[PDB]
Amino acid sequence: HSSLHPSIPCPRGHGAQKAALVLLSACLVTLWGLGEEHTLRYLVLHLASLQLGLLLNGVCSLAEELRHIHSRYRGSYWRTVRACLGCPLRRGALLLLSIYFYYSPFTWMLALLGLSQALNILLGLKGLAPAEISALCEKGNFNVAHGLAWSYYIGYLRLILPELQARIRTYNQHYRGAVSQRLYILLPLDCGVPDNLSMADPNIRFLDKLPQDRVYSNSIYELLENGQRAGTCVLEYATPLQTLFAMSQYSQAGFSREDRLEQAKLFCRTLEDILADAPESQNNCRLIAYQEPSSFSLSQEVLRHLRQEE
Amino acid sequence: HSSLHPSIPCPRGHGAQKAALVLLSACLVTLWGLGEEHTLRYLVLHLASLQLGLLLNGVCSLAEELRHIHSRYRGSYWRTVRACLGCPLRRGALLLLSIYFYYSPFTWMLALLGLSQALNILLGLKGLAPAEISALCEKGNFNVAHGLAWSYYIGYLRLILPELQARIRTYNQHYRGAVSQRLYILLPLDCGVPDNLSMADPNIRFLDKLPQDRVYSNSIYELLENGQRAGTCVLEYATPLQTLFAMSQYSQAGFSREDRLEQAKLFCRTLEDILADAPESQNNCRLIAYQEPSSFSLSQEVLRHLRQEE
């Protein structure tokens, strides 16, 4: 229990599976009504016919995973097969057990299963309950990309992006000076965010403040390509990406450097979708989702996005 | 597509179900090998035997949902049955269609299904693929309770809670004055957060600052019970709860006042679990998860938690 308020739900315990012992016993107190007996033969010759269906679902869902294998699975085939089917060790042990039992019209008996499992997912019947949907979604304690993208747009973006173009031209009309039309939001996929950008590259080393209630001290950085001013624009890291970084450095929380490469591949995607919904903000700021491999320099890919403005 | 970087995965399209048309056609180009024919009879007399299993799973999972019906479903029985089974209109239409077809050993034929669906969830075979687990979890754009609880503990709690007891005794040794041992974090379940607490109740009306790099201007409030100082403690609202409030006032985002009563019933739970993991913080701050119904006064339930300290 330990609930601080009666409205707040306790986490879901094992009350679901302990009712299955009752359901298992209820069909097994029928045993004398069953015994007078090849009922163990028809159990595994039925549980094969479910386990082909989950196998045929993993085959059919593998066409979707194949499109995103490189982005999601770094170009590896074996991670895609593991993601498509799951843990087949508990399943395949029931496969090879069922081979012996029907050994003790099979070409038709596969033709019914592939026909059934096609219609079972084409008419949308492969769909859980809203309890089971909210069971596993409450199970993962780190589902932390939507809560960080939306806290960044509500918290920091929508409070600074309408008033940004005012401070751009004011710093431009004070200067002489050249200022980029929109703010640049860097998105390091490795989540390594330094507090200063002057050590991220020697090219970026610069600082300036801007005039404007809510004190937001944005910083303009100069991109010094081969010792020459190739572009003066405002750049700022993603503040939720330090949150994903500091969660991996919270070793009590089971947050790896691989979960940190999933949410930072998702928060960088959902933030584009949030900025695509707001009309003015999509033309107000540009996201740079740079990832450190090989060697590179991030001052080029800023200037990839900066030169294409004009 | 529209991907800003090749590592970032595009959202999952309909490539999964369009491969099922191939699987449906592959078992249906076997038709002359099937036709020479009651194969439509054995399709629905098989798809009943899957649809009893999903029905028997919803019956068995209903024992778990019943424990949390009041907290999750406000004490309503019909919302619990809808959450346990889902949308039975696409399923029950295949139920009553299958009644006519076997009409055109049933007591045993139910005894095998309840035996099978018990073992199918007791040996953990009711378990999806990590693609399908990450399919629906990417589908809900508002999974925003873990991303707000963890951004509050990493961002604001762990930066102010170690240095809190220093500022409590310093404001106490400057005074005369009585200060509570730990900071109080209010959690309004209706997400209605005013910028001042003096209008939340007339009892709370007070303000003070505290001495201390990171400027965090906490505010101490006096609880004036019947015009008398019943307790002087520091109280502050949940800043992620204004985020859940402002998302509902973003009408382009499909965020209702019912989703806002799920994440604010979850962020208030996960924040307790995060503070339970950190050893010093659990004895450093106390969460008050008050919910406005009926009439009430929140200055009492602060003093419920304040008087029990000593």
Numbering used by the authors:
A (entry chain B), B (entry chain A): 3 to 38, 41 to 108, 116 to 186, 191 to 227, 237 to 317, 321 to 337
Q: What text comes from the article?
A:
Stimulator of interferon gene (STING, also known as TMEM173, MITA, ERIS and MPYS) is an endoplasmic reticulum (ER) membrane protein that serves as a sensor of cyclic dinucleotides (CDNs) derived from infected bacteria or produced by the cyclic GMP-AMP synthase (cGAS). Further structure-based functional analysis confirmed a new STING activation mode shared by the agonist and the SAVI-related mutation, in which the connector linking the LBD and the TMD senses the activation signal and controls the conformational changes of the LBD and the TMD for STING activation.
In fact, several gain-of-function mutants of STING have been identified in patients with STING-associated vasculopathy with onset in infancy (SAVI) or those with lupus-like syndromes. Second, the revolution of the connector helices in the mutant was more obvious than that of the HB3089 bound STING, as indicated by the larger inter-Cα distance (10.3 Å) between residue 147 than that (8.8 Å) of the HB3089 bound STING. However, all the three domains of the SAVI-related mutant, including the LBD, the connector and the TMD, showed overall conformational change similar to that of the full-length STING bound with HB3089, implying a shared activation mode: the connector senses the activation signals and controls the conformational changes of the LBD and the TMD. First, the contraction of the LBD in the mutant was slightly smaller, as indicated by the larger inter-Cα distance (47.5 Å) between residues His185 as compared with that (44 Å) of HB3089 bound STING. Therefore, the conformational change of the connector helix from the SAVI-related mutant must be large enough to eliminate the clash between the two larger residues of leucine. The intrinsic force of the connector of the mutant, which is somewhat correlated with the steric hindrance of the connector residues, is enough to drive the structural changes of the LBD and the TMD through the revolution of the connector helices. Likewise, the 3.75 Å C1 structure obtained from the SAVI-related mutant V147L also exhibited the asymmetric vibration of the outer transmembrane helices that is similar to that of the HB3089-bound STING, substantiating that the asymmetric vibration should be the intrinsic feature of STING.
